Amino acid sequence: NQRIKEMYWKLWIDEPFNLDFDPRDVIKGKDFEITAKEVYDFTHAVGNNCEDFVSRPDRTMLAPMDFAIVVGWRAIIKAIFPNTVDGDLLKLVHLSNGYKMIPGAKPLQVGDVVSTTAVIESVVNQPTGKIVDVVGTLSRNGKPVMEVTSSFFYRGNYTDFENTFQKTVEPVYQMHIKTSKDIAVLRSKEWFQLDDEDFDLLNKTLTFETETEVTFKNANIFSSVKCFGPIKVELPTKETVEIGIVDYEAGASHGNPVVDFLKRNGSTLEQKVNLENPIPIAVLDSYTPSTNEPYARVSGDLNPIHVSRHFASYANLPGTITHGMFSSASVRALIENWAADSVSSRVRGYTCQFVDMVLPNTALKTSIQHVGMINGRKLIKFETRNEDDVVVLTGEAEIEQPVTTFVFTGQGSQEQGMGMDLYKTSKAAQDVWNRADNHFKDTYGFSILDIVINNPVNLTIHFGGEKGKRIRENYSAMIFETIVDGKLKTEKIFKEINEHSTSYTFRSEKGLLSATQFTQPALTLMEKAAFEDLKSKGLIPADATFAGHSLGEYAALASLADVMSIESLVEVVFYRGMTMQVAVPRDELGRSNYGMIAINPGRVAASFSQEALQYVVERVGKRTGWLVEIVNYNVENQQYVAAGDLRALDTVTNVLNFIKLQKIDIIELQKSLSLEEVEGHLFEIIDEASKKSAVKPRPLKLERGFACIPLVGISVPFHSTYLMNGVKPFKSFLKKNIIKENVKVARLAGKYIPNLTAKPFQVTKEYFQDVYDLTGSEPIKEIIDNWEKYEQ
Amino acid sequence: MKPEVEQELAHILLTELLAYQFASPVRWIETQDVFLKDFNTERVVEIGPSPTLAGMAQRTLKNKYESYDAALSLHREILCYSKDAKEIYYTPDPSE
Amino acid sequence: RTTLDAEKVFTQGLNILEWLENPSNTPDKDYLLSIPISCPLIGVIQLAHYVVTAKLLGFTPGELRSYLKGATGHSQGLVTAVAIAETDSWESFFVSVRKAITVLFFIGVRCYEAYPNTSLPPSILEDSLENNEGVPSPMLSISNLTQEQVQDYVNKTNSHLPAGKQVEISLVNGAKNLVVSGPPQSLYGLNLTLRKAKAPSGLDQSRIPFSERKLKFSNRFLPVASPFHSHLLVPASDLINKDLVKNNVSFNAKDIQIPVYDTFDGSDLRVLSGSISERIVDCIIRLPVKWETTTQFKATHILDFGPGGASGLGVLTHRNKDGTGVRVIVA
């Protein structure tokens, strides 16, 4: 075996022949500079014509994922050489090989200098031969880039169990701790070791992220068993956090009693989620080359069995078999082309089972399907057969979805029964709706589910008994936290509800589901529930951009950055809607002299621009002296929404009807006909519509006007300066209900697109500046001034 | 900048963005242009009960992205959770 | 054998005698069409048609070319045009043959190395196919639009692309017959802009006033592996000329016995004071073909030796000159 290894060592390893090193030890491979030439020779050898890997003017040349095996082979293969792993290398079999990109790492480029580390995870004596699982790690700029895994098999009969060891990374086990008995059982186990002895485990969800290292006495009995890893508790945000450690150690065992316990008493979390049915992608023909020399040159795999009849014949092979690692790269090239549409960057994982050997000049049918999802990556399965229809290569790949943006809908869209189909069918959705319903029932004495399902016209809350007084406190304790003259002051949202109130009643003309205080949480939940169901099927790309329209901003933030618990989200959005309801005098019955209209500048005249509408409205506002503003900029020269005084909406909606019937082209009778003096002609058309609307039914109805549609009787002037009163208190409330520790910068940075600053969220002085420029925020200003928070 | 401080600041930022959002206008024109032009989004998925933001995307595309999407051979897919469940969950019906 | 990294291009050899003997041993059409092998081999087809034409007329090559008022070629046909002009006896024919096919060979090898054709995203292929456009290639043909019309559409398409991915008008075959070269993906983005402006080909606007009808035009990709007459190939010009120096090939005006019409000017290549080899390369690699102005000579008959019989340059030229008393013969 030693003589054989000596020859193989001279072919594969450019180092002094020394078999006296520990399998346990890590193996360092020589630094490797990726170059244009090496990439070209490699891609030509494996037949990968992806454009990403070809020299093109003004675009840095990538290197195929596959190139990791060129960089890594010397380190990886050295792992099977030590004396303590004594194999006949002429009876060696490559079983499998995979690459997995580490998240956030960019793929290999032609510039890069890459080194490789390789450890040997497991060496076990199966009855049929000795299996060696190897794990490489390619690093560039002292950062991990991707993990290689390769599995080798020395066919034969092996007794040296003292040189056998196996490490396995267990699936994550989950447990809902319900009873004080459940917790007693856990404390029974020596291996259950909490950071804090007194930790309250009741009604918590623990996860157990566990590795188990084992050594062997013989085929059956383990000589030692180790099982360790963190114990985590789920928070309201769904974030898991370390609260302790599994620590099991044992000599002669027949089994691992930690995994046995977690299997029976817990559910195993699975990362891969199958589709309802596999989606076919393609069935493709490919050939093995007539000569294995080209691959051998670029790979460093001078294994004689691939090139020399006499060696192949000695090893009882059917011929000078094609390199396994060719088939790997060749089939992968197909997957890259057809499953990833030739965007190499999309394929972030590829695994490969060498089911049987293939000779040079074999024709390969390889079928590819979309089979499942995992963390927003399409799970692709494939199968490769030869002319005789024998399976030869199998494996799977993980492929990014095309670039995705999630947009979350605002008020106005809500409908009775919305989200309830999902509520029946989805565990994920049920948990969202229920967490929220329980929160509302226990703290405010109403069901958000009841309101969504039955949309009642009136709903009355009763303050009877010790449970009812606790609820009444929560209604009274709903305050405005303003800071006036240096000192803090308090203001009650619900003026009617005192120490002597037995009940409070919510009213609405047509149904409480369209009263904003209920509408907002209802809509938020519908969206968050839908999102969590999607996330549970692994359908959400890791690097998705997101934004929400008006209210949707809150749903979007919770859905993609879990910034707030379900309870916090609906609590905040409910308070928000209640703030909006107090700000509008409705002192006759359920109606105010405030509303909003949707305008289409296109319909007045094709020439009436955004500037035109912004100017026309700014003038009505200043001149008539009644507040009106553009609050939604939706679709350019097509959908804007203005809000304010119902009189000032009645001037605008008619003034536009006059400019339309006048049939005038803006650009012509702008600076050419009349320079600035146009303002004189504008005031003339404003004043003749202004005094027409300055005497009507005082809660005046708003009519349609060619361009302008009144929005389904919305009583509130959302996003107008009218609500600037409510910013200071609502801010103080947001600070109390969005805890700092729950803001993960990574999940917001360059993905969250706010409504204030239509610019991707960045924690940068430039951003804080832009915010201040549309805000005047005192807390923001003083942060800009001291941006020297770079110092500790 | 330390992680703890980056968070503390990101918090104050988020807080203020939402506080003022309440009573400032909604710049959905620029928002759309950020995710459509600057990010070249090929899948915009509306999470909502009705496809009203999807409707807006389709229009902003028809207006000022006719030649851009063509030239960059950039197939785009506008989906709403309520309308196109099958596309979003990758479950096409028994048609192959 | 002679040329340094030549075999790295000819991945399936160039054993053409074996291919003709045993059809079963011929590479796939993709290999055959890629310029390093198609450039020279098209040259061989033209040279062969010239021979059968001479031998059956009982002429030597020079005797035939004596009967010619002049000669020229479309794109890489220019090479076999100038090579024919020098031709004389059979004994001295294979020196002219050598000259031609060693130009065509280096044009192929260097222009491939400059812009080698990469994997086409299947989505793009499936779409172009279902819209009766071609299999995307680096050259795109457009019937029934003005040059200045086509140039608008490229300017628009080009406005969003960086330098490396821009497309340019390659050939001006006729009034309303153009070809555009660039990256196949960029030309797809052109075809997409184009699909919008065009009307269904069976729309029936027979009841719409002429003035208000919508444009009807063809635009299908051409069967070529490389983007001839475009900025993508410029790098090759310098290298190609150095290879012709090194393999003792040039064309001295003194030797070329008939006018050979420049592909961009219409001028005679003899009157040039530079290198002719260099201009012929430059006319194929970089400069457009103004076929109309190239073909500005007066003659009663024109012989298309060139590949493609009735799809060939012959019939195109006939359509340009119909009604002016010129007869084209597909040789």
Q: B25: domain CATH number?
A: 3.90.25.70
A207 near A174, Cβ under 8 Å? yes
Give the closest of A51, A58, A282 to C118, CB-based: A51
| A524 within 8 A of A571, measured Cβ to Cβ | no
Q: Output the CA–CA distances (angstroms, integers) from residue C4 to A118, C7, C109, C240, in the order listed.
A: 39, 8, 11, 13
Contact C192 B68 (CB under 8 A): no
**DSSP letters of B9-78?**
HHHHHHHHHHHHHTTS-EEHHHHHHIIIIIS--SEEEEESSS-HHHHHHHHHHHHH-HHHHHHTT---EE
Q: Judging by beta carbons within 10 Å of its beta carbon (0-12, 13-18, 19+), is residue C52 exposed, middle or buried?
A: exposed
d(CA A620, CA A628): 8
State the amino acid at position C180 in one-letter form.
V
- A57 secondary structure, DSSP code: T
- What are residue A395's phi and psi, to 5 degrees? 150, 180
In A216-339, which residue ranges form alpha helices assigned H by DSSP? 257-265, 293-299, 309-314, 324-338
A196, exposed or middle or buried, with CB in 10 Å at 0-12, 13-18, 19+?
exposed
Cα–Cα distances in angstroms (integers) from residue A722 to residues A286, A587, A594, A716, B26, in the given order: 68, 17, 10, 10, 15
- Cα torsion A481, A482, A483, A484 to 10°: value is -140
Alpha carbons A357 and A319: distance in angstroms, whole number: 10
**Chain-chain contact of B71 with C196 (C-beta, under 8 angstroms):** no
Residues C181 and C216: their CA atoms lie apart, in Å, by 22
Distance CA B56, CA A411 (A): 15
In single-letter form, the type of residue at position A151 comes to S
Which chains does A contact via 3+ CB–CB distances below 8 A? B, C
CB neighbours (10 Å) of residue A589? 8
Does A57 touch chain C if contact means CB atoms closer than 8 Å? yes
Nearest to A764 by CA among C144, B6, C196, C190: B6
Tokens matching residue C291 = 């076929």
Nearest of A17, A124, A36, A131 to residue A78 by alpha carbon: A17
**Closest of A564, A524, A563 to residue B10, by C-alpha:** A563
The residues that bridge with A96 in the sheet, in sequence order, are: A151, A353
Helix (H, G, I), strand (E, B) or coil at A530: helix
Contact C305, C76 (CB under 8 A): no
**By three-state DSSP, how is residue C181 classified?**
strand
Q: What token pair was written down for C312? A: 């060939």
CA distances from C13 to A48, A431, C17, C32 (A): 19, 66, 11, 11
What crossing angle do the helices spanning C147-159 and C184-197 adopt, rounded to 10°? Answer: 120
Spell out the residues 6+ positions from residue C56 whose beta carbon is closer than 8 angstroms to its own: none
Number of domains in chain B: 1
Q: Which of A306, A402, A385, A372 is nearest to A94 (CA)?
A: A306
**What are the φ/ψ torsions at residue B26 (nearest 5 degrees)?**
-105, 105
**Is some CB atom of chain B closer than 8 A to the CB atom of A779?**
yes
Q: Which residues of C touch B66 (CB under 8 A)?
A: 196
Kindly report the three-state secondary structure assignment for every residue of A194-211.
ECCCCCCCCCEEEEECCE
CA C325 to chain centre: 26
C138 neighbors C197 (Cβ within 8 angstroms):
no
- Strand A404-408 relative to strand B43-47, pairing: parallel
Distant-in-sequence contacts of C197-203, Cβ < 8 A, 24+ apart:
C197/C153
For A744, the closest chain B residue by CA position comes to B7
Calculate the CA dihedral of residues A567, A569, A571, A577 and round it to 10 degrees: -160
CB contact at 8 A, C234 and C146: no
Q: Which residues of C are catalytic?
A: 75
3-state secondary structure of A636: coil
Q: Is A281 helix (H, G, I), strand (E, B) or coil?
A: strand
Greatest C-alpha distance within chain A = 107
The one-letter code for the residue type at B78 is I
Q: Tokens 């999902």 correspond to what residue?
A: A422
SS3 label, residue A332:
helix
In angstroms, the CA C218 to CA C57 distance is 41
Enumerate residues preceding breaks in chain C (C to N > 2.5 Å). Answer: none
Helix (H) or strand (E) holding A412: none
Of the candidates C54, C82, C81, C55, the residue with the CA atom closest to the CA atom of residue C67? C54
Residue A303: DSSP 8-state: -
Burial class (CB in 10 A: 0-12, 13-18, 19+), A390: exposed
Contact in structure between A67 and A37 (CB atoms under 8 Å): no
Q: How far is CA C82 from the centre of its chain?
A: 15
How far does Cα A658 stand from its chain's mean position? 50
Alpha-carbon dihedral C143, C146, C151, C156, rounded to 10 degrees:
-80
Would you say A339 and A331 are in contact if contact means Cβ atoms under 8 Å apart?
no
| CA atoms of A320 and A309, how far apart (whole Å) | 6
For domain C118-225, which CATH number applies: 3.40.630.10, 3.90.1640.10, 3.30.470.10, 3.30.70.3320? 3.30.70.3320
Could you tell me which residues come within 8 angstroms of residue B67 by beta carbon, excluding any fewer than 6 positions away?
Answer: C156, C157, C159, C160, C193
Of A643, A625, A628, A650, nearest to A700 by C-alpha is A650
Q: Exposed (0-12), middle (13-18) or buried (19+): which is A262, by Cβ within 10 Å? A: buried
Tell me whether B68 touches chain A (CB under 8 Å): no
The encoded tokens of residue A344 equal 């190499």
Name the residue type at position A419. Answer: G
| Phi, psi angles (nearest 5°) of residue A334 | -65, -55
Q: Is B70 on the interface with C (CB under 8 A)?
A: yes
What's the rounded Cα separation, in Å, for the pair A406 and B47? 7
Nearest Cα to Cα of residue A314 among A88, A13, A11: A88
Cβ-proximal residues to A778 (8 Å cutoff; 6+ apart), any chain: none
Distance CA A764, CA A775 (A): 17
If we measure between CA atoms, which residue out of C183, A635, C148 comes closest to residue B73? C183
What are the backbone angles phi and psi of residue A115, rounded to the nearest 5°? -110, 160
In order of A615, A652, A653, the CA distances from A620 in angstroms are 9, 7, 11
- State how far the alpha carbon of A372 is from the alpha carbons of A345, A541, A746, in Å: 20, 14, 26
For tokens 């190239």, name the residue.
C294
Residue of C nearest to B74 (CA): C189
* DSSP bridge pairs for C177: C143, C174
CB contact under 8 A, A633 and B16: no
Structure tokens at A435: 């967490």
Q: Is A585 helix (H, G, I), strand (E, B) or coil?
A: coil
Taking the C-alpha atoms of residue A602 and residue A707, their distance in angstroms, rounded to an integer, is: 8
User: Which among A28, A25, A19, A136 is positioned nearest to A86, based on CA atoms?
Assistant: A19
What is the secondary structure of A464-525 as a DSSP string?
-HHHHHHHHHHHHS-B--EEETTEEE--BS-SS--TT-SEEEEE-SS-GGGSHHHHHHHHHH
Query: Does the domain at residues C1-117+226-331 carry the CATH identifier 3.40.366.10?
Result: yes
Q: Which contiguous run of DSSP H or E holds residue A436?
A: helix A427-444
Task: Say how many Å lie between the first and final Cα of chain B, rounded.
Answer: 54
**Domain positions in chain C:** 1-117+226-331, 118-225
Determine the 3-state secondary structure of C170 from DSSP.
strand
Residue in A530, A557, A759 nearest the CB of B47: A530
Categorise residue A688: left if φ over 0, alpha if ψ from -120 to 50, beta otherwise.
alpha
Give me the phi and psi of A218, to 5 degrees please. -150, -165
* Among A130, A116, A128, CA closest to A165: A130
CB contact under 8 A, C193 and B70: yes
The sign of the dihedral angle between the CA atoms of A291, A295, A300, A306 is negative
* C-beta atoms of B73 and C156 within 8 A: no
How far is Cα A479 from Cα A575, in angstroms, rounded to an integer? 9
- Provide the residue range defining the domain that includes B68: 1-93
Method: X-ray
| Those residues with Cβ within 8 angstroms of residue A295's Cβ, 6 or more apart along the chain or in another chain | A45, A46, A289, A301, A306, A323, A325, A326
3-state per-residue secondary structure call for A3-25 = HHHHHHHHHHCCCCCCCCCCCCC
Contacts of A671 (CB under 8 A, 6+ apart): none
Total residues found in chain B within this entry? 96
Best CA proximity match to A95, nearest among A150, A172, A138, A47: A150
The SS3 assignment for A61 reads: coil
Would you tell me how many other CB atoms lie within 10 Å of the CB of residue A510? Answer: 12
| DSSP structure class, residue A745 | G
Residues contacting B1, CB < 8 A, separation 6+:
A763, A789, A790, B9
Whole-number Å distance between alpha carbons of A522 and C85: 86
Alpha-carbon span A576 to A522, nearest angstrom: 13
Between CA C38 and CA C17 the distance in angstroms is 15
Can you tell me the distance from the alpha carbon of A82 to that of A2, in angstroms, rounded to the nearest whole number? 10
**Widest distance between CA atoms in chain C:** 67
Distances (CA, A) of A639 to A598, B55, C31: 7, 11, 54
Q: In terms of DSSP H, where are the helices of chain C?
A: 16-21, 29-33, 35-57, 61-66, 77-85, 93-114, 122-130, 147-159, 184-197, 234-246, 276-285, 291-294, 313-321
**Dihedral over alpha carbons A404, A405, A410, A414 (to 10 degrees):** 0
Query: How many DSSP H helices and E strands does chain A contain?
Result: 23, 29
Query: Within a 10 A sphere around the Cβ of C323, how many other Cβ atoms?
Result: 5
The tokens for A43 are: 């891609």
What type of residue is C223? P
The angle formed by the CA atoms of residues A425, A429 and A432, to the nearest 5 degrees, is 150
The partner residue sitting opposite A630, judged by closest CB among B25, B57, B63, is B25
Using a CB–CB cutoff of 8 Å, tell me whether C192 touches chain B.
Answer: yes
DSSP-assigned letter for residue A279:
E
List the one residue out of C106, C139, C117 whose CA is nearest residue C40. C106
CB neighbour list of residue C126: distance below 8 Å, 6 or more residues apart: none
* CB atoms A755 and B31 under 8 Å: yes
Q: Which domains does chain A have, with CATH numbers?
A: 1-156+272-401 (3.10.129.10), 157-271 (2.40.128.700), 402-456+512-585+714-754 (no CATH), 457-510 (6.10.60.10), 586-713 (3.30.70.3330), 755-792 (6.10.140.1400)
By the CB < 8 Å criterion, does A54 face chain C? yes
- Distance (Å, rounded) from C-alpha A26 to C-alpha A759? 46
**Residue corresponding to tokens 């390659």:** C170
Alpha-carbon gap, residue C330 to C315, rounded angstroms: 8
* C136 reaches B (C-beta below 8 A): no
| Contacts (Cβ under 8 Å, ≥6 apart) of A470 | none
